[PDB]
Amino acid sequence: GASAVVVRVGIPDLQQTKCLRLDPTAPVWAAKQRVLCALNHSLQDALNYGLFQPPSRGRAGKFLDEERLLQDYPPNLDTPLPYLEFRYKRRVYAQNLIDDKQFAKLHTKANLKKFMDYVQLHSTDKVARLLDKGLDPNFHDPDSGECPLSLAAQLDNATDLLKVLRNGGAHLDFRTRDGLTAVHCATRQRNAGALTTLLDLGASPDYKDSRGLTPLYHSALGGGDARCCELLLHDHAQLGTTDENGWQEIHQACRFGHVQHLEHLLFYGANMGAQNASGNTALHICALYNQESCARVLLYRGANKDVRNYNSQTAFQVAIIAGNFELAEVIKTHKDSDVVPFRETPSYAKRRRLAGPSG
Amino acid sequence: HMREYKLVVLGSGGVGKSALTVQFVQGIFVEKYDPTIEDSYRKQVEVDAQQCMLEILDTAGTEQFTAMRDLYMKNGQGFALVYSITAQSTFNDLQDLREQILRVKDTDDVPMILVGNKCDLEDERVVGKEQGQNLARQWNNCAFLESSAKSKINVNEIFYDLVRQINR
Amino acid sequence: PHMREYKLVVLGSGGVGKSALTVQFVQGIFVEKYDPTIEDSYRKQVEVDAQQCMLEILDTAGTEQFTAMRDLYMKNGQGFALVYSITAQSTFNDLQDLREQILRVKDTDDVPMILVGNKCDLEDERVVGKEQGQNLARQWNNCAFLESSAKSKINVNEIFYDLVRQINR
Numbered sequence: 039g040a041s042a043v044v045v046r047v048g049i050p051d052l053q054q055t056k057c058l059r060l061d062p063t064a065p066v067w068a069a070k071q072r073v074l075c076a077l078n079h080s081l082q083d084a085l086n087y088g089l090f091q092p093p094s095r096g097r098a099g100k101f102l103d104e105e106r107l108l109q110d111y112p113p114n115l116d117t118p119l120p121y122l123e124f125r126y127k128r129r130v131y132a133q134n135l136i137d138d139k140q141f142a143k144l145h146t147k148a149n150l151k152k153f154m155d156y157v158q159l160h161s162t163d164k165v166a167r168l169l170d171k172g173l174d175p176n177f178h179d180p181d182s183g184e185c186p187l188s189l190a191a192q193l194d195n196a197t198d199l200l201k202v203l204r205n206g207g208a209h210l211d212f213r214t215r216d217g218l219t220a221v222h223c224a225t226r227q228r229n230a231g232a233l234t235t236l237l238d239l240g241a242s243p244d245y246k247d248s249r250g251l252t253p254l255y256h257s258a259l260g261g262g263d264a265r266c267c268e269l270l271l272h273d274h275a276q277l278g279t280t281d282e283n284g285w286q287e288i289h290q291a292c293r294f295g296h297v298q299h300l301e302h303l304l305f306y307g308a309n310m311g312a313q314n315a316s317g318n319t320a321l322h323i324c325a326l327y328n329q330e331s332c333a334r335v336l337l338y339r340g341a342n343k344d345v346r347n348y349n350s351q352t353a354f355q356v357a358i359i360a361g362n363f364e365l366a367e368v369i370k371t372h373k374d375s376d377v378v379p380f381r382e383t384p385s386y387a388k389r390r391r392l393a394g395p396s397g
Numbered sequence: 398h399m400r401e402y403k404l405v406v407l408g409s410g411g412v413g414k415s416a417l418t419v420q421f422v423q424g425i426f427v428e429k430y431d432p433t434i435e436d437s438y439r440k441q442v443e444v445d446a447q448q449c450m451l452e453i454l455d456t457a458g459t460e461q462f463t464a465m466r467d468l469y470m471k472n473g474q475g476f477a478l479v480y481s482i483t484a485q486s487t488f489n490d491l492q493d494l495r496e497q498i499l500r501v502k503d504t505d506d507v508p509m510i511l512v513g514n515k516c517d518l519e520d521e522r523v524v525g526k527e528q529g530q531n532l533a534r535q536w537n538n539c540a541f542l543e544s545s546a547k548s549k550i551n552v553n554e555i556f557y558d559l560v561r562q563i564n565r
Numbered sequence: 566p567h568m569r570e571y572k573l574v575v576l577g578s579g580g581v582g583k584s585a586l587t588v589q590f591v592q593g594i595f596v597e598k599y600d601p602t603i604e605d606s607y608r609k610q611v612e613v614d615a616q617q618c619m620l621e622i623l624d625t626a627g628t629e630q631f632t633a634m635r636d637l638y639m640k641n642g643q644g645f646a647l648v649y650s651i652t653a654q655s656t657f658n659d660l661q662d663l664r665e666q667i668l669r670v671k672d673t674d675d676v677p678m679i680l681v682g683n684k685c686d687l688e689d690e691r692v693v694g695k696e697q698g699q700n701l702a703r704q705w706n707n708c709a710f711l712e713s714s715a716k717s718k719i720n721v722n723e724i725f726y727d728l729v730r731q732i733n734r
């Protein structure tokens with residue numbers, strides 16, 4: 039980064055120290071990417087590793103949030119070079135510590151499986167007891183691959199359980215074996231209650247998965263009930279996340295005809311004229327996969343139908359080549375008089391201050 | 398064996414929660430303003446000739462997270478509600494915080510202190526001491542203090558008072 | 566038996582293969598990609614002269630050097646590997662000044678040290694003769710000399726093993 043500063047990052051698990059240039063103005067995820075790239079892939083479950091602020095002069099130890107800016111956590115000036123740690127995301131306990139053996143018992147394969155079964159069967163009060171004893175909720179069921187928080191997100195009216203797990207020291211950004219967070223998992227299940235509580239408990243709606251896809255992006259892939267999509271956008275969720283082929287949220291929504299999702303995305307700032315590797319806009323994908331209802335929404339909301347991709351095809355021409363003659367008639371027939379700009383400005387929650395300055 | 402005291406500092410952004418807590422624990426006042434996501438401080442002190450372990454939670458004035466805010470409230474043994482004498486808005490906000498603590502705790506009595514910070518800046522003062530005392534009286538005659546993290550006025554008394562109240 | 570700590574430093578001009586050498590030794594991996602190094606620390610347990618040794622290896626910066634770091638690492642370092650590229654004459658020339666700086670800081674003529682000619686696998690690109698290295702090594706109070714390839718795993722282990730032997734002596 040242009041304003042980048044030099045930070046000494048020690049990986050205790052690899053017994054390595056790496057001095058790296060990190061962008062304070064960039065988000066923590068950016069900085070984490072630089073550490074992992076420097077590691078030459080030496081870590082197992084690397085995604086559940088995070089940069090850690092060492093305890094100093096009374097101030098407690100904590101993990102940097104991936105979706106916060108690096109400069110939001112000021113560095114200690116005790117060292118000549120600012121020092122951060124890369125560690126596995128285990129529960130942060132208080133200075134006061136429980137018996138060493140009493141832990142080894144609590145965290146046996148059998149005991150952990152029993153604990154996950156309590157969460158699965160929504161036994162909130164028993165879950166709370168084991169957390170009070172000092173069980174670390176940040177682990178994976180081997181067969182299932184799911185952490186307790188990811189399982190809790192699946193259950194209906196799970197707010198009770200989610201609060202208890204977060205109080206018991208479960209990480210909100212703890213990823214499952216496959217790299218999804220509890221926020222990803224809530225959205226996939228279309229569980230509005232679970233998602234709202236995670237956001238309420240300090241969770242960011244912009245948590246990235248293995249491929250860097252956001253929960254908003256997952257909702258556009260999955261379609262169905264559009265409530266979770268709106269809740270993420272209401273939470274100032276980030277827009278214009280793209281996969282390897284450059285598809286944005288509207289691109290995926292147009293392909294599977296998720297018209298409610300398209301409408302929410304458009305309303306909250308989605309760039310209609312954005313194009314993927316091929317140069318195709320949402321309207322191009324709408325023509326390719328014969329999504330007449332999605333196509334109408336784009337056209338209605340002012341989408342340019344003269345846009346030509348890198349094969350020099352308009353959406354009209356893509357439809358013709360695909361065989362969707364009725365859809366091409368809709369696109370050719372459409373006129374600027376038919377376009378309706380959005381009535382009113384979108385509404386956002388006041389859950390957290392926006393990353394970066396305000397004058 | 399030492400008794401643990403879990404204290405929470407709540408207020409609107411910029412009131413001086415971090416500066417108060419850091420002055421108490423580290424004996425440093427910082428002019429620079431860095432918004433607080435979340436912070437925990439631990440300090441050992443002697444109150445009523447007894448060794449006490451204070452766990453102080455420094456909250457974010459600017460962020461709101463109701464599930465987290467209720468979890469701070471559920472865990473906290475004692476609460477310091479900080480306002481700026483210079484900023485009227487911060488004083489106004491405290492009434493709702495009071496009622497939220499009582500609702501979560503599910504009891505009318507919770508160890509608590511009303512703190513008027515930035516008392517060194519008399520020229521900038523927009524809130525009267527009487528206003529604070531009047532509000533404190535409304536709150537079942539709750540403890541009230543005017544304090545300056547910069548000038549080290551009433552910083553130690555805030556945390557000492559909370560420990561006394563928890564002990565009773 | 567008691568594990569002794571050995572503090573080793575790898576210094577050279579940019580691109581000589583200090584990082585590749587160190588990473589081959591510690592992780593047994595050769596990295597084609599070139600990322601300049603600010604300062605990197607590796608710890609590895611090895612058996613030298615039938616004794617278990619804890620090696621602390623400092624991988625230094627050839628390019629974008631920091632003075633305070635350089636001043637620290639020379640004072641703290643028990644043994645030093647000065648790496649040059651057989652392919653790049655400039656890197657060989659630069660080493661003389663490094664050696665004199667180490668001796669000045671240490672304030673003694675004898676400091677555990679090895680001269681390393683890296684990228685010995687690239688014979689076609691070779692611009693520095695083995696005899697030139699050996700001749701330089703002789704000038705340096707008969708200092709140890711090696712030709713090594715991080716890519717082909719030639720003489721990688723011997724560099725660090727030799728430094729430990731010298732520190733023991």
Ligand SMILES: Nc1nc2c(ncn2[C@@H]2O[C@H](COP(=O)(O)OP(=O)(O)NP(=O)(O)O)[C@@H](O)[C@H]2O)c(=O)[nH]1
Pocket residue numbers: 408409410411412413414415416417427428429430431432433456457458459514515516517518544545546547548
């Ligand atoms: N003169 C004076 N300045 C103070 C006092 N307390 C805080 N400040 C100043 O006011 C600013 C805000 O301080 P800070 O502790 O960060 O407030 P906060 O409650 O932590 N805010 P936030 O909710 O973002 O964490 C800082 O620039 C600091 O110098 C005080 O008692 N006197």
Ligand SMILES: Nc1nc2c(ncn2[C@@H]2O[C@H](COP(=O)(O)OP(=O)(O)NP(=O)(O)O)[C@@H](O)[C@H]2O)c(=O)[nH]1
Pocket residue numbers: 577578579580581582583584585586596597598599600601602625626627628683684685686687713714715716717
């Ligand atoms: N073929 C071959 N390439 C090598 C060998 N050693 C290093 N290289 C290559 O040379 C380049 C520089 O490697 P590197 O070890 O980073 O050099 P450096 O000494 O670390 N330079 P810096 O001072 O900036 O850290 C890399 O692309 C690396 O793959 C070697 O033994 N054989």
